[PDB]
Amino acid sequence: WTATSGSCKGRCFELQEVGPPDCRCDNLCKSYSSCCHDFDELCLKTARGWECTKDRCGEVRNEENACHCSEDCLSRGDCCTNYQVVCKGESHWVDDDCEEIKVPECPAGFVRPPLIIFSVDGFRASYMKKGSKVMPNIEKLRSCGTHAPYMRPVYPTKTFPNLYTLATGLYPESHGIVGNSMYDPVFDASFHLRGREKFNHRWWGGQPLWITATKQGVRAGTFFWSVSIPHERRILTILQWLSLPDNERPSVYAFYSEQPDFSGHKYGPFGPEMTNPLREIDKTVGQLMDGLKQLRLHRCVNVIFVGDHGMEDVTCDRTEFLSNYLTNVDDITLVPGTLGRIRAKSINNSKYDPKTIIAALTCKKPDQHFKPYMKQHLPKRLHYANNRRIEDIHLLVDRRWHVARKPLDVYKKCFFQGDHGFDNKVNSMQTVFVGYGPTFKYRTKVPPFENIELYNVMCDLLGLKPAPNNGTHGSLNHLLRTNTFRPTMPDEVSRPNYPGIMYLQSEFDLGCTCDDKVENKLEELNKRLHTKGSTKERHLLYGRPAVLYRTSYDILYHTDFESGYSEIFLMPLWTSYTISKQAEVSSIPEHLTNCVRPDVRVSPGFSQNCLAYKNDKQMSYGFLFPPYLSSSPEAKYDAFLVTNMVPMYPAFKRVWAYFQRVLVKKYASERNGVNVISGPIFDYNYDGLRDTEDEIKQYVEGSSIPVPTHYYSIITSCLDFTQPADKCDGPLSVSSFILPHRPDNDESCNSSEDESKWVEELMKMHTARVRDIEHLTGLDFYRKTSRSYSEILTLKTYLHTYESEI
Numbered sequence: 001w002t003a004t005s006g007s008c009k010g011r012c013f014e015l016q017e018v019g020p021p022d023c024r025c026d027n028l029c030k031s032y033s034s035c036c037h038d039f040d041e042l043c044l045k046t047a048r049g050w051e052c053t054k055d056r057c058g059e060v061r062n063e064e065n066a067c068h069c070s071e072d073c074l075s076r077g078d079c080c081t082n083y084q085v086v087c088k089g090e091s092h093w094v095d096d097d098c099e100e101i102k103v104p105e106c107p108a109g110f111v112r113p114p115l116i117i118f119s120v121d122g123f124r125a126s127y128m129k130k131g132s133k134v135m136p137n138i139e140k141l142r143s144c145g146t147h148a149p150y151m152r153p154v155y156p157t158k159t160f161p162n163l164y165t166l167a168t169g170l171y172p173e174s175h176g177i178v179g180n181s182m183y184d185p186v187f188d189a190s191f192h193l194r195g196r197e198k199f200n201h202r203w204w205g206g207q208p209l210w211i212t213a214t215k216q217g218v219r220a221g222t223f224f225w226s227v228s229i230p231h232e233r234r235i236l237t238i239l240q241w242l243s244l245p246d247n248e249r250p251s252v253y254a255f256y257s258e259q260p261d262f263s264g265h266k267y268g269p270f271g272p273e274m275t276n277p278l279r280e281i282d283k284t285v286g287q288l289m290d291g292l293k294q295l296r297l298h299r300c301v302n303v304i305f306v307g308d309h310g311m312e313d314v315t316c317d318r319t320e321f322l323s324n325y326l327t328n329v330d331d332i333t334l335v336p337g338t339l340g341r342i343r344a345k346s347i348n349n350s351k352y353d354p355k356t357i358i359a360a361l362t363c364k365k366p367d368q369h370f371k372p373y374m375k376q377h378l379p380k381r382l383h384y385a386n387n388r389r390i391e392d393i394h395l396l397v398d399r400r401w402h403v404a405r406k407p408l409d410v411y412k413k414c415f416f417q418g419d420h421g422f423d424n425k426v427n428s429m430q431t432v433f434v435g436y437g438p439t440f441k442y443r444t445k446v447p448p449f450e451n452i453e454l455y456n457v458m459c460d461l462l463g464l465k466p467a468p469n470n471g472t473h474g475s476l477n478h479l480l481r482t483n484t485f486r487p488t489m490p491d492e493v494s495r496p497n498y499p500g501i502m503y504l505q506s507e508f509d510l511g512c513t514c515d516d517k518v519e520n521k522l523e524e525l526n527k528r529l530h531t532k533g534s535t536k537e538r539h540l541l542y543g544r545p546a547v548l549y550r551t552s553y554d555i556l557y558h559t560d561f562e563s564g565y566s567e568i569f570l571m572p573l574w575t576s577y578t579i580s581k582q583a584e585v586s587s588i589p590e591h592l593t594n595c596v597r598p599d600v601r602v603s604p605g606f607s608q609n610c611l612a613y614k615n616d617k618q619m620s621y622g623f624l625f626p627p628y629l630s631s632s633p634e635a636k637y638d639a640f641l642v643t644n645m646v647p648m649y650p651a652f653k654r655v656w657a658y659f660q661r662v663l664v665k666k667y668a669s670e671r672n673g674v675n676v677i678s679g680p681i682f683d684y685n686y687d688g689l690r691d692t693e694d695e696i697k698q699y700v701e702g703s704s705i706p707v708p709t710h711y712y713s714i715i716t717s718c719l720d721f722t723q724p725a726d727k728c729d730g731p732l733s734v735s736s737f738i739l740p741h742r743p744d745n746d747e748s749c750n751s752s753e754d755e756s757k758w759v760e761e762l763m764k765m766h767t768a769r770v771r772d773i774e775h776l777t778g779l780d781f782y783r784k785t786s787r788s789y790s791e792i793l794t795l796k797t798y799l800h801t802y803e804s805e806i
């Protein structure tokens with residue numbers, strides 16, 4: 001119930017919300033059907049439109065008008081945004097040369113530069129160049145402030161998950177808004193774009209910027225506008241709020257535009273109909289900037305222009321139907337479109353089986369335009385599994401396509417020509433970031449970055465301490481002139497042991513054999529030196545990784561590689577080695593095919609054994625430092641140490657062996673040497689975080705040898721590839737992956753073919769940030785470089801995407 005009999009007199013766009021049944025006058029009252037009877041009359045005036053004209057200049061104030069051109073309007077804070085241009089001979093902001101803003105130029109009473117976030121739905125990154133001719137205001141923000149060529153959204157590339165990620169710094173799996181549509185099985189409740197359930201606070205996790213601000217005494221404008229409030233009125237409302245007395249005025253404000261998304265769905269991302277929406281959004285930007293200039297705020301306010309996601313060409317004829325795959329299509333519920341999510345239609349149906357559904361959906365048609373995954377097997381870079389609202393079965397849909405349950409869903413629900421939601425590395429899904437104002441840099445281009453990083457920067461802009469989030473605070477310091485956040489490196493928690501030779505060969509009973517009994521004071525001293533770390537500077541280029549949790553581990557040195565060997569997990573946590581451009585690949589000699597050698601530095605009790613692998617019929621083994629890349633026949637024996645062995649399914653060994661034998665040398669050739677750090681990951685509960693020992697669900701049969709869920713590699717070289725990786729003077733270049741350790745290659749439809757036709761494609765899909773690997777391992781990399789810590793934080797958040805030019 002709402003008693004709409006109350007009045008909005010002097011309450012229009014009030015900031016504090018009034019609880020039911022008292023009628024509301026705030027920017028969301030329409031969405032709740034709760035506005036006071038006179039809200040339209042008082043608060044949504046439209047008379048005479050939005051622009052002053054010559055004849056209105058000096059007019060007698062008429063309170064009915066949408067905006068004012070009277071002499072008193074500046075002191076009232078309600079002039080039309082073009083008032084000083086039409087009536088006082090001033091220029092439009094867009095017509096002014098840009099001039100560096102070295103310091104905030106704020107009116108007295110301003111305690112801090114306000115922040116205004118101007119968000120645009122569906123604004124694809126390439127609009128900034130392709131539409132620049134029709135967007136002069138936006139082009140000026142971009143060219144004069146700080147801009148990235150694009151900003152990476154989160155998956156799924158849908159509006160609600162992305163706006164809420166912008167507001168919180170959190171992945172959707174952590175903030176809870178995992179799609180525009182959701183079912184929560186604990187609540188037994190459904191969230192949809194239409195309807196009231198979506199306003200219930202139980203859906204919305206983390207702490208969004210407006211709550212962060214309010215809790216730390218920084219006032220916020222309300223971030224949400226009912227769709228029927230025209231943009232011109234939204235702008236005038238923000239400008240009115242900025243004229244409030246000091247103690248009442250907000251410091252942070254948001255404007256949201258439904259365009260260009262609305263038209264992009266109708267017309268496609270580059271439909272001729274798209275020029276006009278771009279022009280209209282530019283005009284709104286120009287109204288805001290003109291209004292700020294009128295208020296003498298245009299060299300005080302920080303403005304962020306940011307999108308949620310882009311827009312791809314998608315039409316009804318490009319739809320895959322589950323009814324062409326599944327015999328049992330009426331037994332499932334599908335959340336459809338540019339991603340699929342599948343669960344049982346009825347929890348009472350005990351004939352429901354996810355394994356048979358996955359199998360019926362796997363590589364069934366030559367051109368199949370979606371791929372099914374159990375959510376734990378999705379690429380870890382998506383961070384899309386740790387939430388009860390994400391169904392176990394997920395369909396990753398190819399760009400330009402939809403998935404639907406049956407044909408009748410698509411015609412008895414072509415209309416549309418555009419859509420979004422696909423994998424967040426897809427070029428068409430990329431969106432925009434520009435920052436302009438005294439706290440941002442002048443005429444500065446920054447590399448692409450992820451939208452999860454922005455909350456921390458918005459907190460920095462406002463002097464707020466951010467709530468815990470998934471950004472890496474300091475990785476965007478290079479966007480800012482001042483207010484940088486200068487983090488310190490985390491402290492190492494566990495210090496390594498450095499074991500010498502402590503066991504005789506006969507103390508081992510591991511069931512391993514090696515043909516290594518083949519027998520010099522020149523070389524003997526030399527090999528001792530290698531085992532004490534004499535080659536360590538070549539192979540451990542950025543210092544040893546720090547272990548940020550409590551554990552017992554040993555540093556093991558060798559001619560060609562160094563490792564940190566866990567006595568708890570019985571294998572290395574990391575293995576580090578450098579491969580120069582000149583390195584040669586060799587074979588594993590015939591007599592060494594099955595060679596595994598006890599490591600006389602490590603007790604039998606803290607070693608793997610070969611018998612466990614003999615008896616586990618499903619499990620084989622591989623090595624972290626590859627025997628193919630040994631520096632010499634003699635050094636090759638080190639690669640067969642039991643301390644360099646890790647459990648690998650035969651199907652995975654196909655992938656791993658190709659990576660080690662062919663790809664590492666390819667990368668060293670292309671990048672002028674590479675440094676590689678490789679190791680296992682254990683994430684059985686798919687939370688993105690290192691498992692403890694009691695979370696491990698699978699062991700090599702009969703043993704305490706845990707089986708990794710993934711294997712990672714971090715591949716580093718010199719950004720200036722004229723310098724070799726091991727003699728690099730400046731910034732670094734990195735690519736990394738987290739490959740799923742799976743007992744089949746069902747993910748790869750072409751895996752019956754030679755590895756040269758499918759393995760690199762798999763690796764590219766599972767590209768990762770170094771930071772993703774840090775979360776999954778409890779390790780901290782790049783501890784000892786010549787580089788500033790913020791630069792290293794930016795390097796750790798890099799994702800190599802393998803898409804071509806935007």
Ligand SMILES: *[C@@H]1O[C@H](CO)[C@@H](O[C@@H]2O[C@H](CO)[C@@H](O[C@@H]3O[C@H](CO[C@H]4O[C@H](CO)[C@@H](O)[C@H](O[C@H]5O[C@H](CO)[C@@H](O)[C@H](O)[C@@H]5O[C@H]5O[C@H](CO)[C@@H](O)[C@H](O)[C@@H]5O)[C@@H]4O)[C@@H](O)[C@H](O[C@H]4O[C@H](CO)[C@@H](O)[C@H](O)[C@@H]4O[C@H]4O[C@H](CO)[C@@H](O)[C@H](O)[C@@H]4O)[C@@H]3O)[C@H](O)[C@H]2NC(C)=O)[C@H](O)[C@H]1NC(C)=O
Nearest residue numbers: 173174175176204205206386387388468469470687688775
């Ligand atoms: C991205 O960044 C985020 C933020 O930093 C990282 O997420 C944090 O990770 C932590 C570990 O997973 C987690 O810490 C736990 O907090 C528990 C209390 O949680 C509540 O309070 C906080 C603070 O206000 C709140 O934010 C939480 O919000 C979650 O839950 C509500 C729903 O209730 C959602 O609305 C919201 O969206 C959010 O959900 C997300 O996280 C939860 C996990 O908390 C998931 O279940 C969801 O799917 C979703 O992803 C909560 O309201 C605390 O109880 C935990 O403590 C357990 O473990 C510790 C060890 O330290 C131990 O002391 C205790 O014994 C305890 O164990 C007991 O409970 C077990 C499970 O019930 C049980 O098995 C045991 O036997 C014990 O009884 C724990 O410390 C923290 O909550 C989140 N924060 C957020 C916002 O998500 C995230 O990891 C980053 N991602 C990456 C990849 O880096």
Ligand SMILES: CNC(=O)CN1CCN(C(=O)[C@H]2CC[C@@H](NC(=O)c3ccc(Cl)c(C(F)(F)F)c3)C2)[C@@H](Cc2ccccc2)C1=O
Nearest residue numbers: 117119160163164166167198199223224225227254255256
């Ligand atoms: C009819 N309405 C439309 O068709 C378009 N539309 C825009 C407004 N709206 C929202 O803003 C949602 C999206 C996620 C969160 N918003 C940000 O999290 C958010 C909003 C603005 C900005 Cl500017 C930012 C950010 F971070 F970028 F600054 C975040 C609330 C819902 C409606 C809604 C408001 C409040 C709670 C629930 C739903 C929406 O349906």
Ligand SMILES: [Ca+2]
Nearest residue numbers: 683689690691
């Ligand atoms: Ca885990």
Ligand code: NA
Nearest residue numbers: 613616619620
């Ligand atoms: Na085996």
Ligand code: NA
Nearest residue numbers: 745746748751
């Ligand atoms: Na296959």
Ligand SMILES: [Zn+2]
Nearest residue numbers: 122261265420
């Ligand atoms: Zn859309």
